[PDB]
Ligand binder design. Structure first.
Ligand SMILES: Cc1cccc(O)c1
Ligand SMILES: [Cl-]
Ligand SMILES: [Zn+2]
Lengths: 30, 21
């Protein structure tokens, strides 16, 4: 599951940057 | 969701802004 794991690490950083003060949720069951 | 949308092909910051609260 490591490719997805690494991708997610970068998605959260990018979400952090664009969302700013809005913040964001990162979750889900699938 | 976001992994299937953005781990299979590149999402720009404009696309990722969709997921902000
Ligand atoms: C910025 C970023 C990280 C990971 C996947 C993406 O599609 C985009
Ligand atoms: Cl990586
Ligand atoms: Zn990395």
């Amino acid at each position: 599951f490591v490719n997805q794991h690494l991708c997610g690490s970068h998605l959260v950083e990018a979400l952090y940057l664009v969302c700013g003060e809005r913040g964001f949720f990162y979750t889900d069951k699938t | 969701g976001i992994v299937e949308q953005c781990c299979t092909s590149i999402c720009s910051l404009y696309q990722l802004e969709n997921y902000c609260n």
